[PDB]
Design a protein around this ligand. Sequence first.
Ligand SMILES: CCCCC/C=C\C/C=C\CCCCCCCC(=O)O[C@H]1CC[C@@]2(C)C(=CC[C@H]3[C@@H]4CC[C@H]([C@H](C)CCCC(C)C)[C@@]4(C)CC[C@@H]32)C1
Ligand SMILES: *[C@@H]1O[C@H](CO)[C@@H](O[C@@H]2O[C@H](CO)[C@@H](O)[C@H](O)[C@H]2NC(C)=O)[C@H](O)[C@H]1NC(C)=O
Ligand SMILES: *[C@@H]1O[C@H](CO)[C@@H](O)[C@H](O)[C@H]1NC(C)=O
Length: 534
Amino acid sequence: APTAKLANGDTITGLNAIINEAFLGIPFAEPPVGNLRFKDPVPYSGSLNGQKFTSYGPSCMQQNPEGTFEENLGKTALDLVMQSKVFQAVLPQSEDCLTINVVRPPGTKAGANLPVMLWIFGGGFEIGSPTIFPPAQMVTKSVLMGKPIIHVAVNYRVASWGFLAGDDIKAEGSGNAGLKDQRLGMQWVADNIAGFGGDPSKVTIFGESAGSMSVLCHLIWNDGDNTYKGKPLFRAGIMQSGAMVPSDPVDGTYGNEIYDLFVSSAGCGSASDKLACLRSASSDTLLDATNNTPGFLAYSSLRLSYLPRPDGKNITDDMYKLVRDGKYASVPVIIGDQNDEGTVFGLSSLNVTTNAQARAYFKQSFIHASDAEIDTLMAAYPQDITQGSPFDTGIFNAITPQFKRISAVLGDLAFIHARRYFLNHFQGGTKYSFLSKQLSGLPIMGTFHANDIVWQDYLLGSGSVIYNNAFIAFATDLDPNTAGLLVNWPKYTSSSQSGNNLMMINALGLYTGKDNFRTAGYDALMTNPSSFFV
Ligand SMILES: CCCCC/C=C\C/C=C\CCCCCCCC(=O)O[C@H]1CC[C@@]2(C)C(=CC[C@H]3[C@@H]4CC[C@H]([C@H](C)CCCC(C)C)[C@@]4(C)CC[C@@H]32)C1
Ligand SMILES: *[C@@H]1O[C@H](CO)[C@@H](O[C@@H]2O[C@H](CO)[C@@H](O)[C@H](O)[C@H]2NC(C)=O)[C@H](O)[C@H]1NC(C)=O
Ligand SMILES: *[C@@H]1O[C@H](CO)[C@@H](O)[C@H](O)[C@H]1NC(C)=O
């Protein structure tokens, strides 16, 4: 019964879920299969008139997080689970996965002109899909606050299929395919969303983790040109854990190293035209090859095999440099973090137990860093177990003498101080920042990376007034304060400003604070960001 009219005039039918109306599995691009593998997506051209969209399509192919070229039980066990029929029955995957999803308040009709919140899932640029991030909580809340919004989730290619790099990809101009899928989805929204009751001039893009870093990539995309048909694609962005990607270009050292290993595992090591050889390999061969390169939970940890990289075309340069140079879209922004971002990633190196070992690991991970730089970093992030993450836990959580130390560095470099760097240089619009400590006390993990997904999509907690209410107010009014919070959210200007510039969250509620913690670490990492690029 719920129906919507697309830009071409097609009339589609959806699912009435009582609490909302969903249109799930709408294709937005041609299947990037066979000879279209690794290439920019192609707009869908067929007709959908008369078709019904009542269920989530399959996720793009997924890389085993324990994947690696070494043989280990974690990799194997994980393969057994993902490849099992029950798992494949619950969470199906396919290379034919470029679909978009629209969920709206009950009774919405075209012409409602409601703000749109476009969700970009995260998953290490290696796993994930819109299916595991239910929008009901966000949609119900916007109705209750009398500020209804339309939730749009776009699917995009992950791992090798969406982020293969190296000299061949570069030469062909096929870099950052997965970000191009997201960019096409945004154009699909600009063209079609009105028919669903949405206002295309009121789009706020938001994502968590790799999805958050994706949001930043969209601000600096095409050197800050976010227009399509002369109009902005989005008017605001929200970043939940992640800003700049600390990465070398598509044709750099590790981009080629991973590419060579992928090609060899694919059995294309002898082809003179390896891309052509990859494009005709079976789906299982490419899957096995991908799982033979390191996954995000493997020892390599955040030194990712697949991630966005400057390609000289769409991401014209070092992302830190682009933000420093003013090459971004001029939109207001909300960016925040979870107190203990690094704890899950610190679990990947529990065999690093001595200071010498920790030094070697950092050396191995940051190939452009000098001894002197590695020295300043290890001085700024001491072995002292009270200093590490989970933060403020004293002598607790010391699985090994380096765990808390390694966790602190990874979380700061990848998420926390990267956020500070962004806020100190971004002058494109009003900035608001938050820091959550909602789970202080949770053994080992603390206020871990991605716990915000639980409070935003699954359960109500103290953080939910931020993750739902505050975000919906921002999408609607460009000010999180219209949410009617008990604590005013102060604008952020710089980390060295006078008073409180951070909205904080604890188990009891909100309070404000300052973004002035671990400044030695910030200087050790952000003085010359590129020294720590992967
Ligand atoms: C030492 C090496 C060099 C150091 C590093 C240097 C540079 C770093 C460069 C890049 C870093 C980029 C990292 C990007 C992303 C990190 C990877 C990541 O895990 O994300 C995760 C981000 C969140 C995300 C999307 C992931 C997987 C599945 C998701 C879950 C499935 C289920 C669960 C629900 C909450 C379950 C319901 C629960 C109940 C109780 C109701 C979900 C949705 C929580 C959120 C999860 C991946
Ligand atoms: C911790 O374990 C990792 C993973 O097993 C070790 O790294 C591997 O070590 C073997 C043997 O030296 C090498 O063949 C692999 O190439 C390494 N893999 C990677 C991804 O680096 C690591 O040496 C161990 N760390 C310590 C301090 O002992
Ligand atoms: C990427 O950059 C090229 C070169 O400027 C441009 O022609 C192309 O449209 C861009 N792609 C996207 C998806 O914006």
